[PDB]
Amino acid sequence: KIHPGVAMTVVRTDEILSENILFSSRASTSMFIGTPNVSRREARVDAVTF
C-alpha cells in the first residue's frame, strides 16, 4: 500500500439504456412506395422458400 512513482488515470465507459423521444415535423420527407415483388430464393424440394 505504498505509492509508486506515478499516478494512474482510470477511464471507463458506462453503457446506459435510455428511453428516447424522437420528434419530426410534418412534411419532413417525401416517399415513393413501390409495389411488392415475390421471388423464390431457395427452391428446396422439401419446402419452397420465398
Residues that bind a second copy (CB under 8 A): 37, 39-40, 43-45
Q: How far is the CB of 35 from a second copy (least distance, A)?
A: 10
CA separation for the pair 17, 35 (Å, rounded):
37
CA separation for the pair 45, 37 (Å, rounded):
22
Q: In sequence order, which residues have a C-beta less than 8 Å from that of residue 41 and are 6 or more positions away? A: 49, 50
Measured from the CB atom, the residue of 24 and 37 that comes closer to a second copy is 37
Q: How far is the CB of 39 from a second copy (least distance, A)?
A: 4
Measured from the CB atom, the residue of 23 and 50 that comes closer to a second copy is 50
